[PDB]
């Protein structure tokens, strides 16, 4: 995260770290939406241009973490994957449309003070909150610049008007994507950066006090560049696939 600050302990109990076994390294962020299910970006697992195609045995899920590199004995919980589900229409050939994937954990994780699922929005929640100018929050252990942080970073970022998102890039934007970030003349800045891929863009509902995951860190050009914005997977628009996969598979 560029221009964020250190998270507080227990501030994002849904944040998950996707960790490669060999070599041992941070692959991506991810989020816990139930005791058995994790949500991330599909590009974290499959992206043929760079020959990436990870399967279940290649990875570990680390939940409850604060420190990027330390093994947080008695706090964090590590899990193995049972099955990975990538959206059948994820478009890695062109613009990363439908960038989303679900990961079925091998056994339920037990919740605690540091481990707790985020909610998935319904239509009414999405409609009330995903409005230009409203801020959401991105977290991750990724790059601080286009070194790496010792602890989870957090930044609050405003959703941007679809026209302005469309006029900042030559890549084709779809309705399954929204962009966020400060305008070059707003003074404030901040963005996700490499290693933050797959992590949660969340918002707190003022109606019922809950945190909802509105987006997934998907793509951008650089990190914190002026006149450029972060693009996120629109989680509500792909919710029917999510629900379909979880009730068709466990």
């Amino acid at each position: 995260i560029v221009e964020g600050s250190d998270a507080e302990i227990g501030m994002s109990p849904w944040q998950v770290m996707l960790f490669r076994k060999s070599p041992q390294e941070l692959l991506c962020g991810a989020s816990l939406i139930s005791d058995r299910w994790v949500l991330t970006a599909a590009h974290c697992l499959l992206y043929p241009p760079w020959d990436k195609n990870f399967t279940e045995n290649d990875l570990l899920v680390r939940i409850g973490k604060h420190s990027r590199t330390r093994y947080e004995r008695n706090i964090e919980k590590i899990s193995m994957l049972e099955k990975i589900y990538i959206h059948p229409r994820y478009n890695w050939r062109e613009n990363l449309d439908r960038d989303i994937a679900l990961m079925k954990l091998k056994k339920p994780v037990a919740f605690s003070d540091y481990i707790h699922p985020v909610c998935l929005p319904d239509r009414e929640t999405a409609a009330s909150l995903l409005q230009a100018g409203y801020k959401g929050r991105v977290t991750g252990w990724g790059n601080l610049k286009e070194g790496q942080p010792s602890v989870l970073q957090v930044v609050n970022l405003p959703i941007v008007e679809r026209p302005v998102c469309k006029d900042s890039t030559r890549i084709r934007i779809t309705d399954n994507m929204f962009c966020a970030g400060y305008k070059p003349d707003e003074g404030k800045r901040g963005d996700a950066c490499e290693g933050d891929s797959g992590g949660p863009f969340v918002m707190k509902s003022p109606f019922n006090n809950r945190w909802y995951q509105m987006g997934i860190v998907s793509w951008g050009e650089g990190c914190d560049r002026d006149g450029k914005y972060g693009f996120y997977t629109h989680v509500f628009r792909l919710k029917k696939w999510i629900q379909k996969v979880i009730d068709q598979f466990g």
Binding site: I9, D113, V118, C119, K135, R137, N156, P206
Partner: peptide, 26 residues
């Protein structure tokens, strides 16, 4: 059921240091 309610924050009626920035923009 209990999703989105943090043990160390909403369940104790404690606010984190920047969530008011979020609510102020809504």
């Amino acid at each position: 059921a209990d999703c989105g309610l943090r043990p160390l924050f909403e369940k104790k009626s404690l606010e984190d240091k920047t969530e008011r920035e979020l609510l102020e923009s809504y």
